[PDB]
From a paper:
The phosphate-binding motif (18GFGSIG23) is located in the loop connecting β-strand 2 and α-helix A of the Rossmann fold. The adenosine part of NAD+ is bound via loop regions located between β-strand 4, 5, 6 and α-helix C, D, E. Nicotineamide-riboside-binding residues are found in loop regions between β-strand 7 and 8 and α-helix F and O. The pocket is a “boot-shaped” cavity that is approximately 21 Å deep. The entry to the pocket is formed by part of the “track-and-trace” loop (residues Phe-122 to Asp-125) and the α-helix J at the protein surface. The innermost end lies near amino acids Asn-162 and Glu-210. The active site is situated between residues Asn-162, Trp-229, Glu-237, His-296, and the nicotine amide ring of NAD+ at the narrow end of the pocket. Residues Val-115, Val-116, Tyr-123, Asn-135, Leu-138, Pro-163, Gln-240, Thr-295, and Asn-297 form a side pocket at the “heel” of the “boot-shaped” binding pocket, which is filled with six ordered water molecules of which five occur in a nearly planar and equidistant five-membered ring. At least five amino acids (Val-93, Glu-117, Tyr-123, Gly-233, and Ser-236) form a pore at the binding pocket entrance.
Numbering used by the authors:
A (entry chain A), B (entry chain B): 3 to 477
The structure:
């Protein structure tokens, strides 16, 4: 039957019961030993309350805010004598403040994004740099430096960011094998970075194609997606952002860097969900993706950075998202950006409203001796329905990663603040793999210069096909 | 008891029996009186043959080519007893050559596009300038200068190009009436140009939104559209092209002009169907359109040019297409450009496969004292089904414009080569209006700087919202 990995001894407080909370609850119930009365869900929504009541789970209908979070969460995180687990799956809440609260009260923590308090983004005097995921991430790195060790808190452990960090490692191992590079698999960050450098990985796309299709035609003035509409829109309006590789020789005139921090990233002064890049996945083959900002674009490039004695980077891969969302979401973006406003209404596709499709989510490592290698999941909606309730394929990749992260945290409860790149990738993938459908690695001869130049002249660098100059779509 | 407009005392030869041919034939049968055996349809397609045969239509299965066109068409067009009519609704045939042949033999002619012989649109030595609609239109204008007068031949009389030229004239009249710039209705080209100048019309979008939705999901690797896929892809891969107004103070670095010809146009060194512009229609409100090249963009701007004594343009409007095609075609374009190749298959939406929706097609005159005014048709699929068989709402707007052009040519059969702009707009709209559903004029306060600048800096011109600099999408 289903494996039970650990006993949870304290309260489980799930913040948020949207598409991911709903998918994660049944996995938590399935894979951990605890009395159900120990778990409670907090979410302000009436729809969420109704679903919770049908599922027989404790529910508190409240919005967690900067003004109430200490008063509200401390009693819940500290109920009884066991160590609790805060599972944060919300929007509009500060990941940093909640995480720090959990740690100071001895509870484990996990989330899937570095989220700021409601109001952060539409503040009048917020500079574009301050709206970046690089800056949000630096607040978490800062917290780690300020309080080393202590109770484990896992930042950004969803599908992406999260799982894709584990795929990068598995892909590096596979590439090393296929290129005839033999030796000890790496066990430290410095060794992972050197492996990437040695293999000649110039960069990495988080290369995703969602083919889930709805049982109804897209309504006008409704934003449709397979996961958070609020979350997608929020990240889509942040600056286009990327981990910036040492091999790059060109950047747009509207690119900018950062004065402080780890140094791994740049951003563009334009929204990521309206920025296209040339990418590839096995089912899609050549496609456009959107350059949406994501924590892993920075965290993976930072993680795989090799520095010299002086502390300067000698190697770092480029890393960014190349997202082709579901058809209705592509239409929803076209509608949003063309109108200049958010749609009147929105909805997230339920599994019962999906006629077919997969969430093809993987990592595309390029520039090495086999040109490009894609490693990841081809999870279908049909498989998802069989193996995990109350979610679509997009949801299951995320919720199963949260599960893997929780397993790791309970097995390593005094690791301090950690990112998915800090977790044991094999253990995490061992826990996750049952929920990923086919996981495959395939090589391709495709490059961003495929079929170029064509009818019209373009600004391309023919000496090096993988340069960002060739990837970025100039509109 | 639909009205009959004219007797036709000679052969009617329809070249092409695709989406438009299938919608046009029943209107011809409805509105003209002729020996029914005098009509014949020529198309190489097996699908076209089976359709025609199941309806008792006289059919020749052949491709009209550079090699066979004289031998094939002369006998059909001159079969008598009186003057024939060549109705060209094909792809991959030369409009110019067929039109000149019909004229040499005294047959009336009509088409909906200036099309070249097969093979034109890919050459080792075809410069982008020579692929432009401006250049193709210059061959028609040259033909007219070469042989003035004679038998009427109507160039580019579909919905757009075609009907929209009549809409521009009606809109100019309406604007004037609303603003009391009233007087004699213009009767000459120069008077129309001066009315546009006196109203302060800085430019015109052919502003279209197709909301027809398919009853089936978007198939992978199939291009879907509501009219010719071959035709749409062809124009979509031509350079983005526009009539270029005297008020414009900026153009892209990749813009180019022409050494000769009417002087009314420029082109961009990029594909039109991958070029976005900010536009507006009544149902969509603010939307993106694609800057797809079209004959009317040049013909309307040329028609409304005012010249001083020396002969240089002192006034001309900007004019271009701002096309939001149906949801499935938007996705088809994203797929084609992202993949860098044409899909393996294609499908035109039949009326029976459309859930609901309209083809909202009009002209948006901007820059004048009332900011912006949209005039056009909001024909629904439901109304289309009640009034005309075998077509969707896109098709009916085109087929009814061909009907109107045919009526005009029969009424004025010695007018020489003529464009839509040369026809009597009131008579054509009288004929066409029963097939257009609601035809409305709407003012708006929208401009291309609505909501700008916003979260990010952009190169905009705040002194004049309507500058192309502000319309063109440059992320
Ligand atoms: N790493 C990844 O792979 C990944 C993937 C998907 C989603 N996400 C992120 O995970 C989070 C959840 O995604 P989702 O699809 O479930 O979103 P969702 O929009 O479906 O649900 C969000 C929930 O948060 C609740 N909420 C809003 N404000 C709150 C508050 N102040 N306190 C408590 N709850 C509040 C809402 O009522 C809602 O039920 C989002 O932040 C999203 O960006 C990450
Ligand atoms: N002005 C406008 O508003 C407008 C609107 C729609 C279409 N169009 C144009 O009208 C034309 C027809 O459109 P459609 O939607 O019917 O296209 P379609 O692609 O449905 O049909 C084209 C037909 O032409 C036939 N054909 C191909 N090669 C031929 C040849 N060598 N000789 C004879 N026939 C040949 C094909 O077999 C096909 O049946 C196209 O050129 C299109 O671009 C103009």
């Amino acid at each position: 039957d289903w494996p039970v990995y650990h006993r949870i001894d304290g309260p489980i407080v799930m913040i948020g019961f949207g598409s991911i909370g709903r998918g994660t609850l049944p996995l938590i119930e399935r894979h951990f030993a605890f009395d159900r009365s120990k778990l409670v869900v907090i979410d302000p929504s009436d729809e969420a309350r109704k679903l919770a009541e049908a599922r027989g789970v404790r529910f508190i209908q409240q919005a967690v805010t900067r003004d109430n979070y200490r008063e509200l969460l401390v009693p819940l995180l500290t109920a009884g004598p066991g160590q609790g687990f805060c599972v944060n799956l919300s929007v509009d809440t500060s990941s940093l403040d909640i995480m720090e609260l959990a740690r100071e009260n001895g509870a484990l923590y996990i989330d899937t994004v570095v989220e700021p308090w409601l109001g952060f983004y539409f503040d009048p005097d917020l500079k574009p740099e301050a709206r970046s995921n690089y800056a949000l991430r630096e607040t978490v790195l800062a917290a780690r430096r300020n309080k080393p060790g202590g109770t484990t808190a896992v930042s950004c452990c969803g599908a992406n960011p999260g799982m894709v960090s584990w795929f990068v490692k598995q892909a590096l191992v596979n590439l090393a094998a296929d290129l005839g590079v033999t030796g000890e698999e790496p066990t430290t960050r410095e060794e992972w970075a050197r492996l990437a450098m040695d293999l000649g990985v110039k960069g990495i796309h988080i290369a995703e194609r969602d083919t889930q299709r709805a049982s109804f035609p897209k309504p006008f003035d409704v934003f449709v997606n397979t996961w958070s509409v609020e979350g997608f829109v929020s990240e889509g309006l942040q600056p286009a952002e990327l981990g910036w590789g040492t091999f790059e020789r060109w950047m747009p005139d509207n690119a900018r860097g950062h004065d402080s921090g780890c140094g791994a990233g740049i951003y563009l002064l334009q929204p990521g969900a309206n920025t296209r890049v040339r990418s590839w996945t096995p089912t899609a083959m050549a496609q456009y993706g959107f350059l949406v900002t994501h924590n892993e674009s920075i965290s993976i490039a930072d993680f795989l950075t090799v520095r010299d004695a002086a502390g300067q980077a000698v190697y770092r891969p480029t890393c960014h998202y190349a997202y082709h969302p579901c058809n209705d979401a592509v239409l929803s973006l076209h509608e949003m950006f063309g109108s200049g406003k958010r749609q009147s209404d929105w909805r997230i596709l339920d599994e019962t409203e999906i006629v077919d499709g997969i969430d093809e989510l993987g990592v595309l490592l390029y520039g090495h001796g086999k040109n490009a290698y894609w490693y990841g999941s081809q999870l279908s909606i049909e498989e998802t329905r069989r193996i995990a309730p109350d979610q679509n394929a997009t949801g299951l990749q995320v919720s199963s990663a949260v599960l893997a992260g929780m397993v790791w945290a309970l097995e390593n409860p005094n690791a301090g603040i950690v990112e998915a790149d800090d977790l044991d990738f094999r253990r995490c993938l061992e826990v996750q793999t049952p929920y990923l459908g086919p996981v495959v690695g395939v090589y391709t001869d495709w490059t961003p210069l495929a079929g170029r130049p064509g009818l019209f002249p373009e600004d391309i660098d023919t000496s090096d096909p993988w340069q960002f100059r060739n990837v970025l779509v100039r509109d």
